[PDB]
Design a protein around this ligand. Structure first.
Ligand SMILES: *[C@@H]1O[C@H](CO)[C@@H](O[C@@H]2O[C@H](CO)[C@@H](O)[C@H](O)[C@H]2NC(C)=O)[C@H](O)[C@H]1NC(C)=O
Ligand SMILES: *[C@@H]1O[C@H](CO)[C@@H](O[C@@H]2O[C@H](CO)[C@@H](O)[C@H](O)[C@H]2NC(C)=O)[C@H](O)[C@H]1NC(C)=O
Ligand SMILES: *[C@@H]1O[C@H](CO)[C@@H](O)[C@H](O)[C@H]1NC(C)=O
Ligand SMILES: *[C@@H]1O[C@H](CO)[C@@H](O)[C@H](O)[C@H]1NC(C)=O
Ligand SMILES: *[C@@H]1O[C@H](CO)[C@@H](O)[C@H](O)[C@H]1NC(C)=O
Ligand SMILES: *[C@@H]1O[C@H](CO)[C@@H](O)[C@H](O)[C@H]1NC(C)=O
Lengths: 43, 55
């Protein structure tokens, strides 16, 4: 999912096959990405 | 589930004490409170990690 929020901020809901550390870039682990960096871990 | 980042928040309290006329210890209102430094300030501190502890 690619989200366009208020003010033009783009957020993505991306699932990967390997764990991504916080504020970094790349069973499925799902994350919320702000500018290519992991902002929130969903599980 | 969440990311694991921990912050320790230490509050420093410097108390001032005096002896009254009847020998009772009186705590001064001039006691000082110091919070951890954040954005060049030590009077306001907001938690910015996922987990925190206070001391
Ligand atoms: C996300 O939405 C914003 C806000 O609508 C889009 O930015 C607009 O882009 C159009 C393109 O013609 C401009 O006319 C507007 O002026 C822009 N708005 C602002 C506030 O700058 C943006 O393109 C969208 N991002 C996408 C679709 O990826
Ligand atoms: C709390 O901090 C204030 C401000 O630094 C201290 O008041 C100063 O104390 C020094 C040392 O006696 C004096 O030279 C200054 O003139 C004082 N400043 C003012 C504005 O009064 C105060 O002593 C501290 N209280 C404590 C440590 O209990
Ligand atoms: C995820 O898939 C990629 C592409 O096949 C692979 O290189 C990587 O090792 C995989 N990770 C795990 C933890 O299996
Ligand atoms: C997002 O990442 C790109 C690629 O590194 C970078 O050029 C850009 O400045 C970043 N945007 C923000 C708002 O940090
Ligand atoms: C905060 O206090 C703890 C003990 O409660 C100490 O271990 C830690 O280093 C302190 N953190 C600081 C001063 O940033
Ligand atoms: C205030 O913060 C800036 C960065 O915004 C820093 O460069 C500067 O040293 C700070 N000033 C003081 C007096 O701490």
């Amino acid at each position: 999912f690619s989200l366009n929020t208020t003010g033009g901020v783009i957020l993505e809901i991306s699932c990967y096959n390997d764990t991504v550390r916080e504020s970094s870039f790349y069973p499925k682990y799902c994350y919320v990405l702000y500018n290519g960096t992991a902002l929130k871990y969903l599980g | 589930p969440s990311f694991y980042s921990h912050t320790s928040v230490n509050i420093t309290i410097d108390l001032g004490m005096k002896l009254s006329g009847y020998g009772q210890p009186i705590a001064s209102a001039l006691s000082n409170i110091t919070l951890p430094m954040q954005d060049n300030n030590t009077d306001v501190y907001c938690i910015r990690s996922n987990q925190f502890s206070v001391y």
